[PDB]
């Protein structure tokens, strides 16, 4: 695909900072662009990570696969270290829409087997069931990258 890591084989020292209240799963997109999980950061914590130039990164709630921002954006790709200075990846909550935020919370109180039993519009059962999905987000993001002329 378009959305994959380039096998540059050129190291870059990065810092992952989890400035979210969530447990963060960093997700590496391998050379074929298939998402590979890496070890989670607890909220607040930061950690160095040895990565390489042109390696595509993405960060999700480890528990729920909610999307998170890195440097106020969707994806993270380190440049080359300028004079061996580390690249910084600041991970934060996005401003979710109130609708999505509500969905997050209700998913957290209700087993999928019981979405149907909730006293609410038939449309919302479909939204609830539409769990945060890395794969799906990749397709939306890949169409966004082809629509940049």
């Amino acid at each position: 695909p378009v959305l994959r890591s380039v096998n540059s084989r050129e190291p870059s020292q990065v810092i992952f900072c989890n400035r979210s209240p969530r447990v963060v799963l960093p997700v590496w997109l391998n050379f074929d662009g298939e998402p590979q999980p890496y070890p989670t950061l607890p909220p607040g914590t930061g950690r160095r990570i040895h990565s390489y130039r042109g390696h595509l990164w993405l960060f999700r709630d480890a528990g729920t696969h909610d999307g998170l921002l890195v440097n106020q954006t969707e994806l993270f790709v380190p440049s080359l270290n300028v004079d061996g200075q580390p690249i910084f990846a600041n991970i934060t909550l996005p401003v979710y829409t109130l609708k999505e935020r509500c969905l997050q919370v209700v998913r957290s109180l209700v087993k999928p087997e019981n979405y149907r039993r909730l006293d609410i519009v038939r449309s919302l059962y479909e939204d609830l069931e539409d769990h945060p999905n890395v794969q799906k987000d990749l397709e939306r993001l890949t169409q966004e990258r082809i629509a940049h002329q």
């Binding site: 020292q13 950690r47 061996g84």
Partner: protein
């Protein structure tokens, strides 16, 4: 003394741009956190990292060229000890050691 100025020549060589495709894991100390290695410092009792050797060299800290060679080999040895033989960084260590051994062999005395 004239040897430790050759020793410096060898380390210079190893840092050179041509070697970099295989030399690069060894340039700076092993960052155990960055690499996610919980056991490295337990298994490797005395690490060494080419930059530390440059450090020890410029402070005239090696009594002779034998002692310099020992750290270079230690650095590689540590790599060989920590990793399985089929590992990629082992391949790279070997190639860099090829450079070192050849130049270290041809020093005069």
């Amino acid at each position: 003394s004239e040897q430790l100025k050759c020793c410096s020549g060898i380390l210079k060589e190893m840092f050179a741009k041509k070697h970099a495709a295989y030399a690069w894991p060894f340039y700076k100390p092993v960052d155990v956190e960055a690499l996610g290695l919980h056991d490295y410092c337990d298994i490797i009792k005395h690490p060494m990292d080419m930059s530390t050797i440059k450090s020890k060299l410029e402070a005239r800290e090696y009594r002779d060229a034998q002692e310099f060679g020992a750290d270079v080999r230690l650095m590689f040895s540590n790599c060989y000890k920590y990793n399985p033989p089929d590992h990629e960084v082992v391949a790279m260590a070997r190639k860099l050691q090829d450079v070192f051994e050849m130049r270290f062999a041809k020093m005069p005395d």
